[PDB]
Design a binder for this molecule. Sequence first.
Ligand code: SF4
Ligand code: SF4
Ligand code: F3S
Ligand code: F3S
Ligand code: FES
Ligand code: FES
Ligand SMILES: [Fe+3]
Ligand SMILES: [Fe+3]
Ligand code: NI
Ligand code: NI
Lengths: 634, 634
Amino acid sequence: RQNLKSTDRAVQQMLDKAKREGIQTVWDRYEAMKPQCGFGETGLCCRHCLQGPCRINPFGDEPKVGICGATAEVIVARGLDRSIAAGAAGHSGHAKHLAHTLKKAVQGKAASYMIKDRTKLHSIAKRLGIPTEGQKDEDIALEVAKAALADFHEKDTPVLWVTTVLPPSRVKVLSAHGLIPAGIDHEIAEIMHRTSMGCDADAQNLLLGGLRCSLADLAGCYMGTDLADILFGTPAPVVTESNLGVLKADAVNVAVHGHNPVLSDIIVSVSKEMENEARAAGATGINVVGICCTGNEVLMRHGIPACTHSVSQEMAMITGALDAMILDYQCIQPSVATIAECTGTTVITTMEMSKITGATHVNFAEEAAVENAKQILRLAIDTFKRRKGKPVEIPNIKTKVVAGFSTEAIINALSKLNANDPLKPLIDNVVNGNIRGVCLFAGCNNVKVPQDQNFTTIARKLLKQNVLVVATGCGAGALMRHGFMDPANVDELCGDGLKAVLTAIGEANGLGGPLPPVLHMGSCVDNSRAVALVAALANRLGVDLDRLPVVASAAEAMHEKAVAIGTWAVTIGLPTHIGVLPPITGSLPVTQILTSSVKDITGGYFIVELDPETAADKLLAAINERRAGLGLPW
Amino acid sequence: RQNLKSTDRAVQQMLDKAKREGIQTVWDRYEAMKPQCGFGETGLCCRHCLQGPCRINPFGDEPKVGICGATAEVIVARGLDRSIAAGAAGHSGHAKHLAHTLKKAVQGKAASYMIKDRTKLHSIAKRLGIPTEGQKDEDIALEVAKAALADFHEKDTPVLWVTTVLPPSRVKVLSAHGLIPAGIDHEIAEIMHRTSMGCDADAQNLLLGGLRCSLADLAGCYMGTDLADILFGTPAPVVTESNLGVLKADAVNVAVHGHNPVLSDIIVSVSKEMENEARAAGATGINVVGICCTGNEVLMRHGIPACTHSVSQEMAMITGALDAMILDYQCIQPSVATIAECTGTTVITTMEMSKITGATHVNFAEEAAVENAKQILRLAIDTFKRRKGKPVEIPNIKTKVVAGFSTEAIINALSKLNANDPLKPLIDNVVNGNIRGVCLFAGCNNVKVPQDQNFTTIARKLLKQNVLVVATGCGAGALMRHGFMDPANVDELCGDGLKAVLTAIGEANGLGGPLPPVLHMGSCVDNSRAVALVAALANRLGVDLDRLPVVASAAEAMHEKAVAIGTWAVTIGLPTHIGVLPPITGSLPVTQILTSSVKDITGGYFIVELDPETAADKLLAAINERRAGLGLPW
Ligand code: SF4
Ligand code: SF4
Ligand code: F3S
Ligand code: F3S
Ligand code: FES
Ligand code: FES
Ligand SMILES: [Fe+3]
Ligand SMILES: [Fe+3]
Ligand code: NI
Ligand code: NI
C-alpha cells in the first residue's frame, strides 16, 4: 500500500520497482527507525557537553533537569536556536558562493559568468545606496559583491540585506527588540556560543537570539536570489513539465540536484553544445532535468523540466534511465551514492565541502566551469552507452507547469491591468473579496507525512476559498507534480472570485486564458521574492506586514533551512503554519512563546498543526482575522 | 561516600552540607540521569532534520543507517564537527569582545580601559607585520584591533592568528591539506552548513573540515590571550591561594565567574576603591575570589585567590558566605540561579547573550564599566548586610599557589640561566634527561569522573618520571587545589632530574628554592601560551612540533571548547589524551582516523583513555617515542 508513502503516482510506481528489486528507500529506512526516540521528538535531549547525553522526561519523575541545571525551557530553546543557525549557514553559504562568483566574473577571472540582468544589477545597487550614475557596470557589480560579502561580518552598518528589504516601520519594530542582525556569520557564531554549555539559560532571551539569527537567514536568502538573478537572469513566465515522465529513455538523462545555480546554470548551457557528441554515442541529446532547488533554479530561468523533489529523489534513479546525478550541496540523501551501484547512475559531487563516500568527485571551479562541465557530462554520456539495450521503467506521468513568477514578473503581469500602479489591481481584489488573502507554501517533503498530502490538501481548501497561492521549493514541487501549475485546472481548483482574477490577469497578458492556480516563485532562497512582494504591498498600503492578510505554510517541513525560513516568516510578521512537529512540545513555555506571545513582539506566530484539513481552517482563520483588522468583509 | 564525587576535601565538606540542607547538586542531577542514553554516548544519534531523531544501534540489527542514508561514520563526524564549531564560537566570541574593547579604549570611548602592556602591543604588531616605527601607540593598537576583527571573515589573507603563530613548516603541512582557516566565523558557519542534512557525507572530508575549524578555535584563543595581555598586562610570577578557605566570613565575598577579563579585571580594581563603603556596611572589605577561567585571568594577573572550579562551582554558594557571583558567559551551571534562593547569594548576569532565569541582570557596557561595577558591588554589599548574624560554613582548607607563568615569564625565568639563548637550558635538560618531556594539562572537570582524580593521578606519575608539567583552565584549578603549585611540594612530587631543573631555575631567579611542581600558564584561551612556547622550541630546534616530546591531556574534559582545544592540539602535531569518552566510539572508522590515521596528516593524534594510570603510561610512551625519534635516550 504505497499510497501511504507517496500521493504521487509516479513515485508509487517506482516504489513498487524498488521493492521487487530489493533496493532500500527512505521509506524503508524510516520504517526501520520506528519507534523514534520520544526525548528527541519533543526536544528534551541535550548533547551540548561531554557530561551528557542529558534528557528530561516529558512527564513523570526524574530526570527533570539537565546535569548542569539546564531546564526543559533552556534545552528546547538551545536546540531550536542551533537549527536556525544551521539553516542560516546553508542559505547564506549559497549566497556567499554567488557573491564570490560575481566578483570573479567582473574581475575577468571567470568568463563563463557575466552580468546577464543589467536591470536587476542597477536596481539592487539603488536599493543598497550604491551610486550608478557615470559608473561602469563591472564596477557597480564589484561594489554590490563587496557589499554582499560585508554583510557576513560586523561593520558600521547592520545587515543591509535585512534593513534595505523590509519597510522602515518593520525595521523599527525589529530594532526596538534588538533583532536586526549585525552580520550573517557573526550571528551564526553567536548562536553557537550562547547555546553552548553554561551560557544563555533564559528561554525568552535564547529565542530572541533565534529570531535575530533567522533574519540573518533571510538576508542570505535575499542575497542569493539577488545575485543569482544578476548572474543568470530574473525569471519570467515559462512553460515546462514535471515528474518522472520527463526522463527520456533514448536521451542522456542528467539530473541537477542540490542548490546553487553557479553549477546547474552552466550544466544547462554546456549540455546544449554537447548535443552532437551525445548523438555520436547513440543518444538523441542530453536531457537535463531538475531535482530539488537547483532544479527549481533552472526551471524558473530556462524551463528545464523538474524530475522530482525532496523525499522521492531516489525514485529518479530507480527508473534505470538516470545516467548522471550532478550534485553541489544541501538536501541530497546520501543514500544516492549506494543506490547508484544498483541502478548504474553516475553520482558526481562537485563542491569541496560536500562529498559522499562512493560518489565520483569532479572539482568544479568557476574559473574553469565550461571545461569542468564537459568532463562531468562526458561521464554521463559514457553511462548512457553502458545501458545500451537495458530496459528502463520511466513512469509515463507528467504534468504541465507554468512557472517563472518572480516578483518582477508578478508586478509586470499586474501592470497590464494598471500600468502605473501595478499593485492596485491585486489590492482592489483583496478588498472586494475576489482574493481572500495570500498563502505562501514553502519547504520540504518529510517522510513522516505521505508525500505531498499536506500541500495538496491545504492548497485545495484555500484555493476554493479564493486565496491567492504562491509557492517555492519543494512545496512548489509538490504542487507542480499534482497539476496546480497548469492553467487548465483553474476551473476545477479555484473559487469563482480567484478564477475571475487569474482570468482577468491572464487575458490582459494575451493568454486567452488564466494564470495558473498557483504561482511558482522559485527556489527556497526565492522565498525572498515573496518577502519582496509582501513588503511592496505593505509599503503601497502604508501598513506593516503584520496587518496584511498573508500567511505561510511549511506544510511538510524537514530541513534546518525550513526551520530558519519559518522563523523569519514569523519574525517579519506572518502567521506561519508548520505541518510537522518541530522539537518544541517538551517545553510548554517555549511552545507558548512561539505560537502566542511572539505575536506581541513581531506580530507573526507559528501555527503547529499536523492535520492538514485543520491546518487549512487555521490558516483561513488567520487570513480572515487580518481582513477584519483592516475593516474588510470576510 | 562523598569521595566518589570529589577528591577535594573542601568540596566533600560542602557536599555534606548540601545533602543535609536538601540542596540538589550537579552530582545529584547526574545520579538522576542514569542510565544515560547509549546512542548519545556513542555518537549514534542525529537530530539534524525533522525526519529525526535518528539513531543507529552500536551493535545488532536495525536501525543501521539514518533515514536520509547517513551512515554511522557520517553521523559521528557531523556531531563532532558541530561540537568543534561551538567551541570555536565561544573562544573566538570572547576574543571578538576584547577586540572591540581595545578599539573603544584607543578611540576614547571607554576610558576605564587602556594599553597597559606596551611591550606586548608592539610585539604583536611586529608578529602581524603591522608597522610601529613613528606611529602612536593608539594607532598601532587600532591597527591590531582591526586585524583581529578582520580574521573573523574572508579576506585576501588567511587567518593571521594561525599563520603568524605557528612555524612556517607547520603552516606548510597544514596548507597542503587545506586546513588553514579562511576566517573564524566563516569556518564556524561552513561547519554548520556542511553538517546540515544532505551536505557533506564522507567521514574523512568532514573531519578535515573539523581540523580546520579547530584552528579557527586556536586563532580565537591566541587572539584572546594577546588582547587581554595588551589591555590588562602580561602575567608574571605571583603568589596567592586556592580553594574555599579563601572566602572570609567577615568580608563581602564576591566571586567572578565565567570568562572575560573585560569584566573581571574592572571588578577587581573597583572593589579596592569601595573598601571604605564595604566597612561602613560592617565588612572588613570586598574579598574578590575567582571561579573558572575569569578567576584564572585575575589570579594570573593580580593574584586574586581562586575559590573553586568547574564541576564544584555550586559548593562556593553552599558555604553561605558567597554574597555575589558575577557572571559573563561560558561554563556557568544555570543551577546557580536557583541555588541562590537557598543560599542568599546574589547571582548577577552582565552580558546580553548570556542570561539565566531568576538571576539579576545588570547590563555591563565597557563605556560605563566603573559605574556598572559599582552598581554590581553595591548589590553584593547589601547581600553581606542581609547575612549579619547568620553562621557560615567555610571549609578551612586552602593551598598556596605560585602562578603567572606566561610564556614571556617562562622565557625570562630561563634567561637567568642563559641570557641570550633562554630556551637552551630547557632543551639542554631535555637532552640530558633531567626533563623527559612536557605535558600540558587542559580543560574541565566532568561529573562522570571523581573530581580531579584523573588530573592528579596522571600528573603524579608524570612528575615522578621527570616530565615538565604545565597547566591551564580547570586543569590548573585541579592541580592548584591539590598543592601542585606550591614549591614546598617539589621534593615529594618531582623526580630527581625535574627537581634539579626546577631548583636551578628558581635559585637563578633569587627564590632560594624551586619553581613550583606545575607551571600555571593561565586560562583556557591561554592554552595559546603553551602553543607559543612549543612553537618557540620548535623554531629554536629547526624541527616541526610533531617531533617534539610534548603532549597534552584534557583529562576530565566537558565543554565543547575542550573538544575544540583537543582537536587543535592534534592538528598542530601533539599526542593528545582525552580522559572522558567523546561521542565517537559508535564509529570505528572515525575513531581510527582520530586516534591513528591523523598521524599521517598532522603528526598528532588522540589518545582516548579513561583509566588514569593507563593514560599516564600512554602519555609517557608518546613522550618517549618522540625522544627516540630525536635520537635521545629515554
Ligand atoms: S549542557 Fe547541560 S544539559 Fe546539555 S549535555 Fe551538558 S550537562 Fe547535559
Ligand atoms: S539528517 Fe538524516 S540522519 Fe539526521 S535526523 Fe535527518 S534523516 Fe535522520
Ligand atoms: S531543496 Fe531542501 S530545504 Fe526542503 S524545500 Fe526541498 S528538501
Ligand atoms: S572554565 Fe570551562 S571550558 Fe572547561 S576548563 Fe573550566 S569548565
Ligand atoms: S535520548 Fe534520544 S534524542 Fe537523545
Ligand atoms: S536517542 Fe538518546 S541521544 Fe538521541
Ligand atoms: Fe532547497
Ligand atoms: Fe574556561
Ligand atoms: Ni528547501
Ligand atoms: Ni575551559
